[PDB]
Amino acid sequence: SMSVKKPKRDDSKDLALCSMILTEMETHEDAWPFLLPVNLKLVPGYKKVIKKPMDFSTIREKLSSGQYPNLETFALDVRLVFDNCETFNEDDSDIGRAGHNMRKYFEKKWTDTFK
Numbered sequence: 001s002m003s004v005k006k007p008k009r010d011d012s013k014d015l016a017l018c019s020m021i022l023t024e025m026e027t028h029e030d031a032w033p034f035l036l037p038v039n040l041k042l043v044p045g046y047k048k049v050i051k052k053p054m055d056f057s058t059i060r061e062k063l064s065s066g067q068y069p070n071l072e073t074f075a076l077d078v079r080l081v082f083d084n085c086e087t088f089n090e091d092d093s094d095i096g097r098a099g100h101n102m103r104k105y106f107e108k109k110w111t112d113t114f115k
Contacts, residue, residue: 011070011071014070014071015063017071017113017114018063018068018071018074019063021106021109021110021113022056022059022060022063022078024105024109025056025078025102025105025106026056026060028101028102028105030097030098030101030102031056031098031102032098033085033095033098033099034055034056034081034085034098034099034102035055035056035057036055036056036057037053037055037057037058038050038053038055040053045088046088049087049088050084050087050088052080052084053084054077054080054081054084055081056081058077059074059077059078059081062077071114075110078106079103079106081099081102082099082100082102082103082106085098085099086099086100
């Protein structure tokens with residue numbers, strides 16, 4: 001509360017570390033469904049159904065341009081990529097499987113880097 005704070009966590013490396021995680025997600029062999037925005041002209045139903053599209057290239061641009069106020073807002077956009085994927089793709093599809101795999105991969109890196 002006012003004049004009452006928990007001890008200050010060092011957040012000075014968060015930006016660099018989120019960048020490294022994102023690089024690792026970019027270079028995973030199962031990243032291909034997520035590298036670029038879904039083409040809303042060419043994929044029927046996506047525009048209407050997925051209210052907040054997100055992809056790794058868009059996260060990269062937001063990250064590089066100071067549009068994440070903190071590491072939690074960065075995690076929210078990564079998870080949004082996978083939540084979108086589950087909303088639109090059957091579990092038993094290459095893309096559905098890719099999203100589960102990448103979510104797992106992300107969550108482990110996130111815990112190991114920050115928790």
